[PDB]
Amino acid sequence: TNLCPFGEVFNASKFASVYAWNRKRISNCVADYSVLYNSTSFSTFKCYGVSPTKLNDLCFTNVYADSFVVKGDEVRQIAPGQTGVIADYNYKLPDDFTGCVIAWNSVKQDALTGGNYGYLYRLFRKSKLKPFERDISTEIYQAGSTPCNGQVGLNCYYPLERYGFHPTNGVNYQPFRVVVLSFATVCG
Amino acid sequence: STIEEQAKTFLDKFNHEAEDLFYQSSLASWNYNTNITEENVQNMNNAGDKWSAFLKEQSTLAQMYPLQEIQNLTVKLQLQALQQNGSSVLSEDKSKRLNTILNTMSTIYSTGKVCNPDNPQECLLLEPGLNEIMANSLDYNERLWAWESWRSEVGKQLRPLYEEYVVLKNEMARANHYEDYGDYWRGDYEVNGVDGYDYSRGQLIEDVEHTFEEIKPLYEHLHAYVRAKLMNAYPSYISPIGCLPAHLLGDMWGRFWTNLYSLTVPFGQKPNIDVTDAMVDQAWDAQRIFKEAEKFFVSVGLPNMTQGFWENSMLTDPGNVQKAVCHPTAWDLGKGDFRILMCTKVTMDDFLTAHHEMGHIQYDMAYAAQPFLLRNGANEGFHEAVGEIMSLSAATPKHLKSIGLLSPDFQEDNETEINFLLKQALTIVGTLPFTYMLEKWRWMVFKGEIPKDQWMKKWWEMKREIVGVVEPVPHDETYCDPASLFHVSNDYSFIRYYTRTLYQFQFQEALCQAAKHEGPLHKCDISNSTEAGQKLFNMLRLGKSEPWTLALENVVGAKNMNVRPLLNYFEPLFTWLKDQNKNSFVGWSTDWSPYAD
Ligand SMILES: [Zn+2]
């Protein structure tokens, strides 16, 4: 009846920083689930709870999709049950995930010679993130036993740090765009 | 909220803000070293100005997490490397002298030239000119001249600076609670708080000395042999029982006796191994050399060079326009950018010194996953020694027939091997007395056991006693010969070369025992041997995260420097030399000299 706008989520030119990861809610529509396989660009494309072929022949109650940018050493933490700054303090997936994490290298776009620092991540938090939680608080981290007074100093750090994306990193430290497809009106 | 937890968080902000500032410096220090332009000279210094300043900012910060409250030793190690407030411990007025001295000394050494009496029209730098004399010339007086005019016309200028140098450097070393500056340098080997693996600074002077004593028999017999061979090239100038004249040793100082090979080849009838010619014919490029070097490391399991290594490294030489420093170098720039910069000619000796550099890169890449501060070899000597064993294994005739650069019609009789071993002895064994002296002279100066009015007295006494080498012209306290050597007048420790030599044969014995090699060690070749790779990598991936005595013991099974593998590598030569000397004199008199006086 209606087509699911997954392209404008994959085809978008600008992405969110991983700490403020985007989420678009796809419902009451129908789209192709194999237009995401013979793309042969996705370095990573692993469903952790479902199967690409079956999806077409199953209808779903809710298809959510999240989009963000992380470094290559960290797309491994966009997987169920892992620990790391990104998965603990920026984007957490549940242990009962039924879905699919799709990624690819974006040096072409997100790396600029001499610096590209637009993308952020949250280095410190007071606790870990409940699954699918989003924390966007630019509030000072009290690492010490000394209060910070909204002022940076000894054992008091600003929580966001900046990704430096250069086009001569290792695949190690290069930018990467991720999409996390989450899962009775969205058919196929 | 304990100090250890707080220290971890501080190190964890330092690890993320340095990985980029250190990458901005490496990234800009590459452009000055590949495009040499006065513009790029400035982008470099600013990047290093930012980096250098950032460290001392963090340095003063780290000190509010005292080690006295740190238990996790990796945490303790990082805080230590960072808490060392270093040369800033002086007054700001003295730090200006110290750095202007170091820069004045450096700019004298690089820019010193001497001009020749019988032709003032021609003047010579050391850089390309005197070094060509001191390597090839067979005329005693010309060698005498380039030796003596350097140590006087340029060595004298460094004498006053060197005094002021020592005075200031001592102030910094004591302030940091080292007894002298030589003691400060010995701290590189220092290990504490780990049982059965500790290692004090004062334990190095003994071990370097206890190990040198087992070198003497080999050296003495190499000395005597080379002397007898020199006593032909210079019939009326050399005494068959006297020290060797310092200007006849093959280069400006005698650091390596490499250039004396033609004047001392054992079986000169035998055709030497030089594959320079087999490469040209099968068409080889710096791409192929470094592709071959890459293959050797993959035959032992190690990872192949990163995609960005092939794209950003400088392997050849545009030349003409752009002006790079062509010293072979290996680069850990940060964030996965590994690069080797070498202006590679199609020689063989440039193919073996590329296996050296990729050894570095292979090593840099193993401990790349460590924390930022713990990214360096286990000690100063570890990192060049990993490279030498790669040249040792690739130079071998067994290896050159694998890759197809040596003819299968090459006969490996005993004579070609004694010829191969002696060329190794001139370099490897030569520099050990030379290196052990030069530090022990400094160690003493910094300890004050040698006054200013006995500086050059006790230098050449030690050249005579320890090294069997004599000056051709008497030198007073107005000279300053030590600082006529590049390491001395640039503020670099030099015992690193002594310990690296000993390590590499320990490493090479092991890796060649796990490759199930049967034969003399000198013919080993750890290629195709992934059991060898795995034992090496296990140490490589540590980095300085473990006490160096444990890294060495991960490979060779011993907690210390060991000469028994060194002697072993050269024993087929040693025994030949002994017979060769049955009617020569072995040793030297401390009080002969080539001059009336
Ligand atoms: Zn090297």
Q: Where are the domains of chain A?
A: 1-114+167-188, 115-166
CB B582 within 8 A of CB B227: no
Cα B194 to ligand 1 centroid, rounded to whole Å: 30
Amino acid letter, residue B247 = H
Q: Do B1 and A144 touch (CB under 8 A)?
A: yes
Query: In whole angstroms, what separates CA B464 from the centre of its chain?
Result: 24
- Using a CB-CB cut-off of 8 Å, the residues of chain A touching B64 are 154
C-alpha–C-alpha distance, residues B557 and B549, integer Å: 10
Burial class (CB within 10 angstroms; exposed 0-12, middle 13-18, buried 19+) of A182? buried
CB A103 within 8 A of CB A43: yes
In which residue are the tokens 């029982």 written? B241
Torsion angle (degrees, nearest 10) of CA A168, A171, A175, A176: 150
Torsion angle (degrees, nearest 10) of CA B6, B175, B455, B380: 0
Closest CA to A175 of A66, A69, A43, A87: A69
C-alpha–C-alpha distance, residues A152 and B171, integer Å: 36
Host H or E run for residue B116: strand B113-116
What experiment produced this structure?
X-ray
Give the nearest chain B residue to A113 (CA atoms).
B27
CA angle B400, B404, B409 (to 5 degrees): 80
CA angle B297, B300, B306 (to 5 degrees): 40
Amino acid letter, residue B77 = L
Q: Do B23 and A164 touch (CB under 8 A)?
A: yes
Cα B387 to ligand 1 centroid, rounded to whole Å: 6
Would you state the structure tokens that stand for residue B351, as one six-digit string?
Answer: 């193919």
Integer CA distances (angstroms), B27 to B45, B369, B395, in order? 12, 20, 33
Cα B428 to ligand 1 centroid, rounded to whole Å: 15
- Using a CB-CB cut-off of 8 Å, the residues of chain B touching A157 are 9, 13
Cα B339 to ligand 1 centroid, rounded to whole Å: 13
φ/ψ of A179, rounded to 5, equals -135, 135
> With a CB-CB cutoff of 8 Å, which residues 403-422 of chain B face chain A?
none
C-alpha–C-alpha distance, residues B458 and B435, integer Å: 16
Contacts within 8 Å (CB) and 24+ apart, A129-137: A129/A87, A129/A88, A129/A89, A129/A90, A129/A91, A129/A92, A130/A92, A131/A92, A131/A93, A131/A94, A131/A95, A132/A92, A132/A93, A132/A94, A132/A182, A133/A92, A134/A19, A134/A20, A134/A21, A134/A23, A135/A19, A135/A89, A136/A19, A136/A20
Question: A121, A168, A176: best mutation site toward chain B, by most B Cβ within 10 Å?
Answer: A168
Residue B404, CA atoms < 13 Å, CB-side half-sphere = 7
At CB < 8 Å, which residues of chain A contact B? 114, 123-124, 143-145, 154-155, 157, 161, 164, 166, 168-173
Kindly report the number of other CB atoms within 10 A of residue B27's CB atom: 22
For residue B403, give the DSSP letter: T
Residues before each break in chain A (C–N > 2.5 Å)?
Answer: 183
Q: How many helices (H) and strands (E) does chain A have?
A: 4, 9
CB B249 within 8 A of CB B260: yes
B461 vs chain A: nearest CA distance in angstroms?
Answer: 53
B111 Cβ partners below 8 Å, 6+ apart? B125
φ/ψ of B112, rounded to 5, equals -60, 130
Strand-pair category, A44-47 with A175-182 = unpaired
Host H or E run for residue B80: helix B73-83
Cα B378 to ligand 1 centroid, rounded to whole Å: 15
Determine the angle formed by the axes of helices B548-556 and B530-540, rounding to 10 degrees.
170
User: B2 touching A, CB under 8 A?
Assistant: no
B6 vs chain A: nearest CA distance in angstroms?
Answer: 6
First to last CA, chain A: 10
C-alpha–C-alpha distance, residues B30 and B562, integer Å: 38
φ/ψ of B107, rounded to 5, equals -70, -20
Integer CA distances (angstroms), B50 to A35, A114, A117, A166, B46, in order? 48, 15, 18, 19, 6
C-alpha–C-alpha distance, residues B426 and B219, integer Å: 10
In three-state secondary structure terms, A91 is coil
In which residue are the tokens 């060194």 written? B566
User: B61 touching A, CB under 8 A?
Assistant: yes
Q: What is the largest CA-CA distance in chain B?
A: 79
Question: B17, B20, B307: best mutation site toward chain A, by most A Cβ within 10 Å?
Answer: B20
Q: Do B6 and A170 touch (CB under 8 A)?
A: no
Determine the angle formed by the axes of helices B92-111 and B155-175, rounding to 10 degrees.
150
Strand-pair category, B244-245 with B469-470 = parallel
Kindly report the number of other CB atoms within 10 A of residue A158's CB atom: 14
Torsion angle (degrees, nearest 10) of CA B203, B209, B214, B219: 150
Residue B339, CA atoms < 13 Å, CB-side half-sphere = 25
Integer CA distances (angstroms), B498 to B190, B237, B429, B479, in order? 17, 31, 10, 26
Which residues of B are designated catalytic?
357, 487
Strand-pair category, A120-122 with A141-142 = unpaired
CB A141 within 8 A of CB A150: no
Would you state the structure tokens that stand for residue A177, as one six-digit string?
Answer: 């765009």
C-alpha–C-alpha distance, residues B499 and B205, integer Å: 12
CA angle B77, B79, B84 (to 5 degrees): 105
C-alpha–C-alpha distance, residues B38 and B33, integer Å: 11
Determine the angle formed by the axes of helices B495-511 and B431-447, rounding to 10 degrees.
140
- Looking at the partner chain, which of A145, A161, A166 has a beta carbon nearest the beta carbon of B16? A161
Kindly report the number of other CB atoms within 10 A of residue B444's CB atom: 15
- Using a CB-CB cut-off of 8 Å, the residues of chain B touching A169 are 308, 335-337
C-alpha–C-alpha distance, residues A136 and A116, integer Å: 21
C-alpha–C-alpha distance, residues B594 and B143, integer Å: 14
In which residue are the tokens 């993308």 written? A119
Host H or E run for residue A99: strand A99-105
Integer CA distances (angstroms), B203 to A179, B432, B569, in order? 58, 19, 26
In three-state secondary structure terms, B64 is coil
Kindly report the number of other CB atoms within 10 A of residue B337's CB atom: 23
Closest CA to A128 of A98, A86, A99: A86
Give the residues across from B337 on adjacent strands: B334
C-alpha–C-alpha distance, residues B597 and B476, integer Å: 13
A168 vs chain B: nearest CA distance in angstroms?
Answer: 6
Q: How many helices (H) and strands (E) does chain B have?
A: 24, 6
C-alpha–C-alpha distance, residues B496 and A86, integer Å: 42
Kindly report the number of other CB atoms within 10 A of residue B263's CB atom: 17
Three-class SS string for B357-389?
HHHHHHHHHHHHHCCCCCCCCCCHHHHHHHHHH
User: B8 touching A, CB under 8 A?
Assistant: no
Integer CA distances (angstroms), B17 to A177, B74, B215, in order? 23, 19, 47
Sheet architecture: strand order including A44-47? A22-26, A63-71, A175-182, A99-105, A44-47
CB B481 within 8 A of CB B473: no
φ/ψ of B328, rounded to 5, equals -50, 125
User: B583 touching A, CB under 8 A?
Assistant: no
B178 Cβ partners below 8 Å, 6+ apart? B184, B187, B201
Integer CA distances (angstroms), B415 to B270, B405, B412, B565, B572, in order? 7, 21, 8, 22, 11
In which residue are the tokens 């071993």 written? B421
Integer CA distances (angstroms), B263 to B266, B344, B385, B407, B566, in order? 9, 29, 29, 27, 25
Q: Residue ranges of the alpha helices (H) in B84-215?
A: 92-111, 131-136, 140-149, 155-175, 181-186, 202-213
In three-state secondary structure terms, B179 is coil
First to last CA, chain B: 74
C-alpha–C-alpha distance, residues B363 and B374, integer Å: 13
B587 Ramachandran zone, left/alpha/beta (phi>0; psi -120 to 50): left
Give the residues across from B124 on adjacent strands: B114
For residue B272, give the DSSP letter: P
Q: What share of chain B is helix, strand, coil (3-state, %, to 5)?
A: 60, 5, 35
Is B327 annotated as contributing to ligand binding?
Answer: yes
* R_g (Cα) of chain A, nearest Å: 18
Would you state the structure tokens that stand for residue B47, as one six-digit string?
Answer: 């990047």
CB B317 within 8 A of CB B343: yes
- Looking at the partner chain, which of A124, A157, A169 has a beta carbon nearest the beta carbon of B335? A169
C-alpha–C-alpha distance, residues B49 and B71, integer Å: 34
Closest CA to B553 of B563, B565, B564, B539: B539
Would you state the structure tokens that stand for residue B486, as one six-digit string?
Answer: 């590049």
Burial class (CB within 10 angstroms; exposed 0-12, middle 13-18, buried 19+) of A54? exposed
Cα B361 to ligand 1 centroid, rounded to whole Å: 10
Three-class SS string for B437-483?
HHHHHHHHHHHCCCCHHHHHHHHHHHHHHHHCEECCCCCCCCCCCHH
Give the residues across from B314 on adjacent strands: B341
In which residue are the tokens 């699954």 written? A131
Q: Do B9 and A145 touch (CB under 8 A)?
A: no
Kindly report the number of other CB atoms within 10 A of residue A90's CB atom: 27
* R_g (Cα) of chain B, nearest Å: 25
Closest CA to A16 of A182, A154, A183, A178: A178
- Looking at the partner chain, which of B1, B13, B308 has a beta carbon nearest the beta carbon of A157? B13
C-alpha–C-alpha distance, residues B107 and B442, integer Å: 22
φ/ψ of A186, rounded to 5, equals -95, 95
C-alpha–C-alpha distance, residues B254 and B75, integer Å: 44
C-alpha–C-alpha distance, residues B385 and B296, integer Å: 17
Q: Do B23 and A157 touch (CB under 8 A)?
A: no
CB neighbour burial string for B360-383, b if at least 16 within 10 angstroms, e if fewer: bbbbbbbbbebbebbbbbbbbbbb
Q: Do A170 and B306 touch (CB under 8 A)?
A: yes
Residue B111, CA atoms < 13 Å, CB-side half-sphere = 8
Amino acid letter, residue B231 = M
CB B304 within 8 A of CB B294: yes
A170 vs chain B: nearest CA distance in angstroms?
Answer: 4
Is B356 annotated as contributing to ligand binding?
Answer: yes
φ/ψ of A83, rounded to 5, equals -120, 145
Question: A155, A157, A163, A176: best mutation site toward chain B, by most B Cβ within 10 Å?
Answer: A155
Integer CA distances (angstroms), B47 to A118, B88, B580, in order? 21, 20, 58
